[PDB]
Amino acid sequence: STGSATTTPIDSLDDAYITPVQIGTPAQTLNLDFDTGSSDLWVFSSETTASEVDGQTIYTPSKSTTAKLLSGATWSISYGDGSSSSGDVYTDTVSVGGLTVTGQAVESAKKVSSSFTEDSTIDGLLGLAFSTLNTVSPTQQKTFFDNAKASLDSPVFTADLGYHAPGTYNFGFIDTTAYTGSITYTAVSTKQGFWEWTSTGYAVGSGTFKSTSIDGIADTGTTLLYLPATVVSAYWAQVSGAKSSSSVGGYVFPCSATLPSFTFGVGSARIVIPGDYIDFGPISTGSSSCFGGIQSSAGIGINIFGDVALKAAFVVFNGATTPTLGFASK
Template sequence: MAHYHTYTKYHRPAPEHVQKAAAADAGTGSVSATAEQYDSEYICPVTVGNDQLNLDFDTGSSDLWVFSTITPSSESSGHNLYNPNSGSSEQGETWSITYGDGSGSSGVVYADTVVVGGATVTSQAVEAATSVSSTFTSGNSDGLLGLGYESGNTCTPSQCQTFFGNFQSSASSALFTADLQSSGGSYDFGYIDASKYSGSITYVPTLQQNPSYWDFTADSDANGNAIGYSIMDTGTSLWYLPSASVSGYYANVPSAQDSSSAGGYVFSCDESLPDFSVGIGGTTFTVPGAALNFQPLGDGSGDCFGGLQVDDGLPGSIFGDVFMKNFFVVFDLGNNQVGVASQS
């Protein structure tokens, strides 16, 4: 595994014999996650067929789609491409996904080998894009690897199994973990690395009320405002909570205002933000104030956009990267639960 990680660290495809040896290592895998500017997303090296791609891991969706040689060049320029070859087979399926921000992609489906940090699936549905929206065209990722529940997959006429749905049968444990930080981080598949968290892990059951989502019930914030239905989502940059929680927090930030022009709460970049605490499964988790300053507006005003925003119009509260990069999070498919612990 150490030998394999050298290749992933330098974003190079490992030789086939190294991949196979790593895959046999107790049904586990571990992959590094690189933080993009302002921690807006985390991308990871993934081998798809014979190609090395950098994918955004998204627990809020269930499609593994990639830029490919059948993506129009006007949409794929600057990206690493998946090239279906003799080792792949077209499945006669199509797919089309639209995300909450209006971005999306669509295309056809191949079956090929996918390797994520040594975790290997030899006949994985790979959704090759024939059309990609501008949000992804201008981004740094070469596609998305959905880690949500299979029921949210968009393949038709038959749903495609997710990568982890396929891998779990050979995994040491049917779970994966996210250890995201401002400096980067990692995803581990099939095991829990005890060196990456401290104290105990607090688990809450998933509700499975919506396709794809790792949804659960959160308790309340430190001021007693109820939070309720929530989603743990690595594919969302910000943290969204009910209006009472968000307005109550920014009431303690003198320069904060709900800006119609910026589309959310902003404040002076010089502001020293207070910490913010929420309860999950009876345990209090505190996000440091510095983590709630998402990024400067870039308009010369000296204001910054808040990492905590109101969940109006969303399916519930979204615990995105602003929250998750401060904690060690377990996605336990075998027991249908989410776990949260302090990072070591």
């Protein structure tokens, strides 16, 4: 089997991407944030505290003839941005782009933190990291990909995120028309539960490539590119007037600037992020200070190849017995 679904930016900045997902019988379609940095499929629901729902579409398990309470199971998750959610668990039929999994754990939110409530466009998350990170207790549950894997034509999914435009998540096949050149594959460590790999270096603009190992995670659920402070300083030094602002929470730059590109290495291959992809717009409405799309990871504990980086590539998440990641230009 295969599946193919379009993913759409939630706003004009590409702050996140939503993908329609069918849950239950008859189908209830919710727009989920596909997150290769986590491993829970959770949704706003008829059980979510009413004051914490503001415009999201909810899953109502009592209206699904295939929903079954997973008795005794609870979940609770905290994300790197400080947001969180928790609740109980149903199993139900879940379909993405024509690919159907029966018995998928659908984690129903009883509580969500303010940032989820405040984002009316995201109805939940669909985790695509390794199932060892799934938070369901006392019986850990498998991701949608893990459940689908054995049925797929090939044990892979691909992320093809657009810049200011829709893109595609494919399951079970590699669309050879969706990228240019060849796909360069690189090793993955699953020891932390992430799609963790080592970039071979970077360049700023037309500058020379610096060969240096950068361990980080391919994370579709993180907006920006978070890299070591040395790398990020080298980038922003090429932008007149750019500075790190403790009050704003990162590097800002004059909105009048033209940003240089940023290149990252994948083995001997190179992925070029155009300068425009690094512009996240005014820090507040009407400001002439703009927020940068490359930020320091120094406060995180891990480097994160988020959407800013991934949207410059066609990315293969290869879930073979020994997982690997593939990157191609497009």
